[PDB]
Amino acid sequence: SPVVEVQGTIDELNSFIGYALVLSRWDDIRNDLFRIQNDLFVLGEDVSTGGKGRTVTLEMILYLVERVTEMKAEIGKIELFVVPGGSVESASLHMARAVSRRLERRIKAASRLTEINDNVLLYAAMLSSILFMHALISNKRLNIPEKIW
Amino acid sequence: SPVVEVQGTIDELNSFIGYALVLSRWDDIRNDLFRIQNDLFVLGEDVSTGGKGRTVTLEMILYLVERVTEMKAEIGKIELFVVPGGSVESASLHMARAVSRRLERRIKAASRLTEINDNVLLYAAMLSSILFMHALISNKRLNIPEKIW
Amino acid sequence: SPVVEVQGTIDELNSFIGYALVLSRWDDIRNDLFRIQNDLFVLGEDVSTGGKGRTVTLEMILYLVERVTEMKAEIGKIELFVVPGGSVESASLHMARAVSRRLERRIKAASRLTEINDNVLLYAAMLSSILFMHALISNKRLNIPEKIW
Amino acid sequence: SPVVEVQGTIDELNSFIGYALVLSRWDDIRNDLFRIQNDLFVLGEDVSTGGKGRTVTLEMILYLVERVTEMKAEIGKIELFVVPGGSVESASLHMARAVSRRLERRIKAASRLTEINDNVLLYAAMLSSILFMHALISNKRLNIPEKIW
Amino acid sequence: SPVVEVQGTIDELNSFIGYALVLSRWDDIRNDLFRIQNDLFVLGEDVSTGGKGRTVTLEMILYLVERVTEMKAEIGKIELFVVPGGSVESASLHMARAVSRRLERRIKAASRLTEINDNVLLYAAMLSSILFMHALISNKRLNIPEKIW
Amino acid sequence: SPVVEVQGTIDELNSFIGYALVLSRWDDIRNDLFRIQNDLFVLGEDVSTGGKGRTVTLEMILYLVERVTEMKAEIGKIELFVVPGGSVESASLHMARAVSRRLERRIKAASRLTEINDNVLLYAAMLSSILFMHALISNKRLNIPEKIW
Amino acid sequence: SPVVEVQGTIDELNSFIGYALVLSRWDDIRNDLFRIQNDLFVLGEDVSTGGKGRTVTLEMILYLVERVTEMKAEIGKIELFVVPGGSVESASLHMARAVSRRLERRIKAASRLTEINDNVLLYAAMLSSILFMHALISNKRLNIPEKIW
């Protein structure tokens, strides 16, 4: 039942990814988001069945980790307090990642209430990180230097 | 007071419809969303006055039901676990419908707390359904075949 | 800890401003939103340090008040129950202001729980008002007369 | 048996933390490393019993995540290709984190061979990250500005 | 050829002993490590010549056994899962002994591949034990009571 | 992928240089190690891009050769089987050079597997040599005559 | 054209090796010099074709490195400022290695002028080193202890 407010936020996020995906131009970015959208579905079933069904695997989170590390190299010095937006695609991704931070904080509650896989939460945490990286990457690749606070 | 968090989500939704409406190209879709935006206003007053004022009528929900049934015919086999987005208009509508599922789950709480019309909740439930149908319809009409999980 | 759900909504809002900023064409509007985005950051630190650090100053809220009063003059009779959207920029701003009303209602909770500056809440309240004004202003300046309920 | 080469690297790491801990002056840093040293022990048993015994919990990794996020704020713009060392404590921590990257790459092999908890690997990954943060933090707090490549 | 990865670890260890030796204050400890450093050299030739040359003698391992037994008396109850470090000298020795466990596990592989004296492996095993004893002894003699898991 | 175990050892080495650099007192030595630390970075990119990017140049290895030849003159008769350590700086450098021999033996494997520049391996070989010279030089300059086997 | 003065010195060296080869008694030494004489030929073609043809491979230089390291063990403390000669074979090799230092300093010029493989120069550098080792080895094996300056 309060785990129902978790799934709602999952599809609320899938909707925000869905928008930032049609928006983004980069093939790598697009494929990451498509895979993320399918993993969001696996993440839904891992809460509903509560581990019984399609469990959120380590290999899924590691692909997020890999991409985070690979894209990190393009940006170089990743800044703190980066004023969101600038590019349309960057702004669209910042909106999806904000909802990702909104998801993990909804999961943390349902984690306290009923049993749910640790991987679900880790994946959500990771998703925020990977989503921020695409919004910096969309900006460098468009030559729109990010305005820092 | 916790019914104040219900109205906030109503206008948060009206804002998301408002975006998907300027976005969508189809006249039918646009008119449905305009009517939905005005019904959202009636839905606001039906919580505030708590039935005293402009009650959310059956005829309002039935127009949603009618459109759902009419559009259903265009899509044919409506799929399960349809990865959201693809088209800009479709993605924009998926975002508005996600917030619609976010509204009815906020109403369900205020329903438990203080008295509010049953129609308000039914309308919200129906709104999610009608909003999904426009995002499938925007996709077929744009010949962007939906990617299913 | 429930103050962590406040910051999340702050950056969730910063993301929505960020989108409406790249979207809006007007220089005045853009600069207001940029300043608002930086003030959102000051607003973050004023919750975290709980007044210890960079306090949200009166002068910050007064700049919002000034702009509200200056833009008010352009619209003239500001209407009640204005159906959101019409213009792309107007719809984008209505979405950001809806989240602003979502922020102050999250702050009101954390206000009851732990100590946080009164200015933080006042600023959020003011932000909703200033954000509505830009979505009316984008509409008059684009000659898209707002549809009232 | 090739899982025996994993434990060896765990205590080889515990030894490197042990050195950087007596070395570091900061109380926060010291306590993180002490807790990390005890978690390394839990991490040992989670490989040996292969989940049967003292499993490496989510809450353990989340404390690493929390510290990473809290310390991140002190450094601000965390740079890429930061030439290691400068301070004695910073150099000592860089050596321990290098061995941490050496541990997770030993785990990844034993992960392919026999069953071992996903958390074990995630914890190791996280440990590299948290260990880098202490070596940047030791540097800012000592006012030894890091030389970037 | 894979026996070349054995020698590398021998001098990698000699380097770690070399550091813990300049570090340690105790004359007995220092002399043990010096002798250990010279025996490491004999141990190198016993792999290279593969028994032909300077064989690793029983008397060499027995001196390690003697010291282990003599120092054992000073510590009394030698604890299990002793969190490494505390003292600078103790931490430095724990690092050298960790590499000693790293050496015998490299030897065990080269033992399976080509012929090498049994004493070489026994000596390495013994070396880990004697190296742990110095890191407990440095701690009691400095009155830094070891923190046990 | 097994080339990933090569980079890990590169930064594991950079960490050991980093320590021996803060440790060493001599300006020449320090500058050599700083340059070596930056060349280690070039060496990383020459494996990752596999020659595509920042190739490890001849001129880089020749600067190592030059220093080896210049420092050689100070020591005079460079001895065989020199028991490592004596000085703190000398011991610290012996540890870094031991890891350098550990790096080239990791490269030799990745050389057999996938294509990587010959210069990368030559540089690593050279690095062991130059690192030994600093640990003899730290000793003569401190008047700590090296104990030979 | 100034690369023609490089080849002349190559065959001028091959002639000096040729003499020291008939001169030397040791089978190992003889085979090294024969291989060196054939590698000198490969080294000729690598300048003429300028990399197009038979490139001077890493494996060639590594065989020189291997022999240098293997013979190093026989001499032990290799001295500085070793007065050349003593034995006929030693004197003959010192003459060939002097010309080898004469070759690399001719290559360094042609390196500045036109493109030539880095390996060519490295090989020449290495050749001087390997040639010195044979002249020390001829001396120990003949029991003619070298007179040092």
Side-chain angles (χ1 to χ4, degrees):
Chain A
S1 288
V3 303
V4 191
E5 169 64 48
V6 166
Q7 18 220 57
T9 304
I10 296 154
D11 92 271
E12 195 166 359
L13 185 60
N14 226 322
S15 297
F16 275 93
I17 313 289
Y19 179 87
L21 152 128
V22 46
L23 252 268
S24 235
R25 324 171 187 239
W26 300 267
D27 326 302
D28 41 301
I29 288 177
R30 290 180 107 114
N31 286 336
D32 279 5
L33 303 178
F34 191 81
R35 188 183 281 248
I36 279 147
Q37 291 200 252
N38 283 238
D39 291 349
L40 269 145
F41 267 106
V42 176
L43 205 106
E45 204 205 301
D46 202 18
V47 170
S48 322
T49 70
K52 291 170 192 76
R54 292 186 189 273
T55 169
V56 161
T57 121
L58 161 80
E59 119 240 294
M60 284 156 66
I61 325 184
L62 292 182
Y63 291 144
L64 299 202
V65 172
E66 277 176 59
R67 283 302 284 115
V68 150
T69 59
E70 285 175 311
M71 283 190 286
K72 248 155 72 264
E74 305 193 41
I75 311 118
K77 65 162 198 219
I78 283 105
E79 289 250 17
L80 213 318
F81 11 97
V82 211
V83 167
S87 136
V88 266
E89 295 80 23
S90 176
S92 78
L93 284 141
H94 270 151
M95 276 158 73
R97 66 142 280 281
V99 181
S100 185
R101 281 272 291 267
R102 206 233 297 196
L103 182 47
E104 61 173 317
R105 68 201 193 243
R106 299 266 183 272
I107 291 157
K108 270 152 204 168
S111 158
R112 297 219 165 268
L113 269 290
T114 141
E115 285 210 281
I116 27 164
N117 271 65
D118 321 66
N119 301 318
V120 171
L121 186 29
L122 282 139
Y123 190 79
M126 262 312 304
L127 214 53
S128 317
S129 323
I130 205 204
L131 291 166
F132 174 80
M133 285 293 159
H134 295 111
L136 308 188
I137 271 312
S138 273
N139 273 333
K140 147 179 159 288
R141 288 185 207 179
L142 257 147
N143 197 38
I144 301 158
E146 284 266 74
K147 289 279 179 290
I148 345 286
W149 180 44
Chain B
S1 288
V3 303
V4 191
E5 169 64 48
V6 166
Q7 18 220 57
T9 304
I10 296 154
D11 92 271
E12 195 166 359
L13 185 60
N14 226 322
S15 297
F16 275 93
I17 313 289
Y19 179 87
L21 152 128
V22 46
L23 252 268
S24 235
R25 324 171 187 239
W26 300 267
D27 326 302
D28 41 301
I29 288 177
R30 290 180 107 114
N31 286 336
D32 279 5
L33 303 178
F34 191 81
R35 188 183 281 248
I36 279 147
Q37 291 200 252
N38 283 238
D39 291 349
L40 269 145
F41 267 106
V42 176
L43 205 106
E45 204 205 301
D46 202 18
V47 170
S48 322
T49 70
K52 291 170 192 76
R54 292 186 189 273
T55 169
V56 161
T57 121
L58 161 80
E59 119 240 294
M60 284 156 66
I61 325 184
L62 292 182
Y63 291 144
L64 299 202
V65 172
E66 277 176 59
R67 283 302 284 115
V68 150
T69 59
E70 285 175 311
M71 283 190 286
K72 248 155 72 264
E74 305 193 41
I75 311 118
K77 65 162 198 219
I78 283 105
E79 289 250 17
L80 213 318
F81 11 97
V82 211
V83 167
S87 136
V88 266
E89 295 80 23
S90 176
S92 78
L93 284 141
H94 270 151
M95 276 158 73
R97 66 142 280 281
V99 181
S100 185
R101 281 272 291 267
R102 206 233 297 196
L103 182 47
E104 61 173 317
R105 68 201 193 243
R106 299 266 183 272
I107 291 157
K108 270 152 204 168
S111 158
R112 297 219 165 268
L113 269 290
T114 141
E115 285 210 281
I116 27 164
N117 271 65
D118 321 66
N119 301 318
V120 171
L121 186 29
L122 282 139
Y123 190 79
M126 262 312 304
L127 214 53
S128 317
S129 323
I130 205 204
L131 291 166
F132 174 80
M133 285 293 159
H134 295 111
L136 308 188
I137 271 312
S138 273
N139 273 333
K140 147 179 159 288
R141 288 185 207 179
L142 257 147
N143 197 38
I144 301 158
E146 284 266 74
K147 289 279 179 290
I148 345 286
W149 180 44
Chain C
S1 288
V3 303
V4 191
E5 169 64 48
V6 166
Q7 18 220 57
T9 304
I10 296 154
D11 92 271
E12 195 166 359
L13 185 60
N14 226 322
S15 297
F16 275 93
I17 313 289
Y19 179 87
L21 152 128
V22 46
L23 252 268
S24 235
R25 324 171 187 239
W26 300 267
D27 326 302
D28 41 301
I29 288 177
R30 290 180 107 114
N31 286 336
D32 279 5
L33 303 178
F34 191 81
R35 188 183 281 248
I36 279 147
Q37 291 200 252
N38 283 238
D39 291 349
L40 269 145
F41 267 106
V42 176
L43 205 106
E45 204 205 301
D46 202 18
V47 170
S48 322
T49 70
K52 291 170 192 76
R54 292 186 189 273
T55 169
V56 161
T57 121
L58 161 80
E59 119 240 294
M60 284 156 66
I61 325 184
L62 292 182
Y63 291 144
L64 299 202
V65 172
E66 277 176 59
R67 283 302 284 115
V68 150
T69 59
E70 285 175 311
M71 283 190 286
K72 248 155 72 264
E74 305 193 41
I75 311 118
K77 65 162 198 219
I78 283 105
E79 289 250 17
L80 213 318
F81 11 97
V82 211
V83 167
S87 136
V88 266
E89 295 80 23
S90 176
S92 78
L93 284 141
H94 270 151
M95 276 158 73
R97 66 142 280 281
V99 181
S100 185
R101 281 272 291 267
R102 206 233 297 196
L103 182 47
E104 61 173 317
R105 68 201 193 243
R106 299 266 183 272
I107 291 157
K108 270 152 204 168
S111 158
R112 297 219 165 268
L113 269 290
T114 141
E115 285 210 281
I116 27 164
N117 271 65
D118 321 66
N119 301 318
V120 171
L121 186 29
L122 282 139
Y123 190 79
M126 262 312 304
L127 214 53
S128 317
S129 323
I130 205 204
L131 291 166
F132 174 80
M133 285 293 159
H134 295 111
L136 308 188
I137 271 312
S138 273
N139 273 333
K140 147 179 159 288
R141 288 185 207 179
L142 257 147
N143 197 38
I144 301 158
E146 284 266 74
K147 289 279 179 290
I148 345 286
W149 180 44
Chain D
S1 288
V3 303
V4 191
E5 169 64 48
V6 166
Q7 18 220 57
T9 304
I10 296 154
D11 92 271
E12 195 166 359
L13 185 60
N14 226 322
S15 297
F16 275 93
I17 313 289
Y19 179 87
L21 152 128
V22 46
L23 252 268
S24 235
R25 324 171 187 239
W26 300 267
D27 326 302
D28 41 301
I29 288 177
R30 290 180 107 114
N31 286 336
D32 279 5
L33 303 178
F34 191 81
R35 188 183 281 248
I36 279 147
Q37 291 200 252
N38 283 238
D39 291 349
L40 269 145
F41 267 106
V42 176
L43 205 106
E45 204 205 301
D46 202 18
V47 170
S48 322
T49 70
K52 291 170 192 76
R54 292 186 189 273
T55 169
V56 161
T57 121
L58 161 80
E59 119 240 294
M60 284 156 66
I61 325 184
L62 292 182
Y63 291 144
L64 299 202
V65 172
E66 277 176 59
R67 283 302 284 115
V68 150
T69 59
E70 285 175 311
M71 283 190 286
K72 248 155 72 264
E74 305 193 41
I75 311 118
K77 65 162 198 219
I78 283 105
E79 289 250 17
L80 213 318
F81 11 97
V82 211
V83 167
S87 136
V88 266
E89 295 80 23
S90 176
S92 78
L93 284 141
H94 270 151
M95 276 158 73
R97 66 142 280 281
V99 181
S100 185
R101 281 272 291 267
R102 206 233 297 196
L103 182 47
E104 61 173 317
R105 68 201 193 243
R106 299 266 183 272
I107 291 157
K108 270 152 204 168
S111 158
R112 297 219 165 268
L113 269 290
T114 141
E115 285 210 281
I116 27 164
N117 271 65
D118 321 66
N119 301 318
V120 171
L121 186 29
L122 282 139
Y123 190 79
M126 262 312 304
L127 214 53
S128 317
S129 323
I130 205 204
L131 291 166
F132 174 80
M133 285 293 159
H134 295 111
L136 308 188
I137 271 312
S138 273
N139 273 333
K140 147 179 159 288
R141 288 185 207 179
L142 257 147
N143 197 38
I144 301 158
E146 284 266 74
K147 289 279 179 290
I148 345 286
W149 180 44
Chain E
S1 288
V3 303
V4 191
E5 169 64 48
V6 166
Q7 18 220 57
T9 304
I10 296 154
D11 92 271
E12 195 166 359
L13 185 60
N14 226 322
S15 297
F16 275 93
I17 313 289
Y19 179 87
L21 152 128
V22 46
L23 252 268
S24 235
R25 324 171 187 239
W26 300 267
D27 326 302
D28 41 301
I29 288 177
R30 290 180 107 114
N31 286 336
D32 279 5
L33 303 178
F34 191 81
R35 188 183 281 248
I36 279 147
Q37 291 200 252
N38 283 238
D39 291 349
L40 269 145
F41 267 106
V42 176
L43 205 106
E45 204 205 301
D46 202 18
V47 170
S48 322
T49 70
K52 291 170 192 76
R54 292 186 189 273
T55 169
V56 161
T57 121
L58 161 80
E59 119 240 294
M60 284 156 66
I61 325 184
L62 292 182
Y63 291 144
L64 299 202
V65 172
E66 277 176 59
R67 283 302 284 115
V68 150
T69 59
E70 285 175 311
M71 283 190 286
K72 248 155 72 264
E74 305 193 41
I75 311 118
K77 65 162 198 219
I78 283 105
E79 289 250 17
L80 213 318
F81 11 97
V82 211
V83 167
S87 136
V88 266
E89 295 80 23
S90 176
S92 78
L93 284 141
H94 270 151
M95 276 158 73
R97 66 142 280 281
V99 181
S100 185
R101 281 272 291 267
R102 206 233 297 196
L103 182 47
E104 61 173 317
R105 68 201 193 243
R106 299 266 183 272
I107 291 157
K108 270 152 204 168
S111 158
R112 297 219 165 268
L113 269 290
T114 141
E115 285 210 281
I116 27 164
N117 271 65
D118 321 66
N119 301 318
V120 171
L121 186 29
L122 282 139
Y123 190 79
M126 262 312 304
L127 214 53
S128 317
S129 323
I130 205 204
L131 291 166
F132 174 80
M133 285 293 159
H134 295 111
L136 308 188
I137 271 312
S138 273
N139 273 333
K140 147 179 159 288
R141 288 185 207 179
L142 257 147
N143 197 38
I144 301 158
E146 284 266 74
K147 289 279 179 290
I148 345 286
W149 180 44
Chain F
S1 288
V3 303
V4 191
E5 169 64 48
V6 166
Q7 18 220 57
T9 304
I10 296 154
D11 92 271
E12 195 166 359
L13 185 60
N14 226 322
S15 297
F16 275 93
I17 313 289
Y19 179 87
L21 152 128
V22 46
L23 252 268
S24 235
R25 324 171 187 239
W26 300 267
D27 326 302
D28 41 301
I29 288 177
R30 290 180 107 114
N31 286 336
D32 279 5
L33 303 178
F34 191 81
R35 188 183 281 248
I36 279 147
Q37 291 200 252
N38 283 238
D39 291 349
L40 269 145
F41 267 106
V42 176
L43 205 106
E45 204 205 301
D46 202 18
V47 170
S48 322
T49 70
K52 291 170 192 76
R54 292 186 189 273
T55 169
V56 161
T57 121
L58 161 80
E59 119 240 294
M60 284 156 66
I61 325 184
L62 292 182
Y63 291 144
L64 299 202
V65 172
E66 277 176 59
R67 283 302 284 115
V68 150
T69 59
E70 285 175 311
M71 283 190 286
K72 248 155 72 264
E74 305 193 41
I75 311 118
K77 65 162 198 219
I78 283 105
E79 289 250 17
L80 213 318
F81 11 97
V82 211
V83 167
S87 136
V88 266
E89 295 80 23
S90 176
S92 78
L93 284 141
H94 270 151
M95 276 158 73
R97 66 142 280 281
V99 181
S100 185
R101 281 272 291 267
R102 206 233 297 196
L103 182 47
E104 61 173 317
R105 68 201 193 243
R106 299 266 183 272
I107 291 157
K108 270 152 204 168
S111 158
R112 297 219 165 268
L113 269 290
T114 141
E115 285 210 281
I116 27 164
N117 271 65
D118 321 66
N119 301 318
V120 171
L121 186 29
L122 282 139
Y123 190 79
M126 262 312 304
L127 214 53
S128 317
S129 323
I130 205 204
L131 291 166
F132 174 80
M133 285 293 159
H134 295 111
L136 308 188
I137 271 312
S138 273
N139 273 333
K140 147 179 159 288
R141 288 185 207 179
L142 257 147
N143 197 38
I144 301 158
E146 284 266 74
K147 289 279 179 290
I148 345 286
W149 180 44
Chain G
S1 288
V3 303
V4 191
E5 169 64 48
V6 166
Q7 18 220 57
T9 304
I10 296 154
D11 92 271
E12 195 166 359
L13 185 60
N14 226 322
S15 297
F16 275 93
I17 313 289
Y19 179 87
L21 152 128
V22 46
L23 252 268
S24 235
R25 324 171 187 239
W26 300 267
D27 326 302
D28 41 301
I29 288 177
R30 290 180 107 114
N31 286 336
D32 279 5
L33 303 178
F34 191 81
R35 188 183 281 248
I36 279 147
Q37 291 200 252
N38 283 238
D39 291 349
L40 269 145
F41 267 106
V42 176
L43 205 106
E45 204 205 301
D46 202 18
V47 170
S48 322
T49 70
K52 291 170 192 76
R54 292 186 189 273
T55 169
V56 161
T57 121
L58 161 80
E59 119 240 294
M60 284 156 66
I61 325 184
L62 292 182
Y63 291 144
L64 299 202
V65 172
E66 277 176 59
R67 283 302 284 115
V68 150
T69 59
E70 285 175 311
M71 283 190 286
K72 248 155 72 264
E74 305 193 41
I75 311 118
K77 65 162 198 219
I78 283 105
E79 289 250 17
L80 213 318
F81 11 97
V82 211
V83 167
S87 136
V88 266
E89 295 80 23
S90 176
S92 78
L93 284 141
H94 270 151
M95 276 158 73
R97 66 142 280 281
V99 181
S100 185
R101 281 272 291 267
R102 206 233 297 196
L103 182 47
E104 61 173 317
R105 68 201 193 243
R106 299 266 183 272
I107 291 157
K108 270 152 204 168
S111 158
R112 297 219 165 268
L113 269 290
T114 141
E115 285 210 281
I116 27 164
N117 271 65
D118 321 66
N119 301 318
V120 171
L121 186 29
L122 282 139
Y123 190 79
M126 262 312 304
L127 214 53
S128 317
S129 323
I130 205 204
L131 291 166
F132 174 80
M133 285 293 159
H134 295 111
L136 308 188
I137 271 312
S138 273
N139 273 333
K140 147 179 159 288
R141 288 185 207 179
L142 257 147
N143 197 38
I144 301 158
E146 284 266 74
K147 289 279 179 290
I148 345 286
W149 180 44

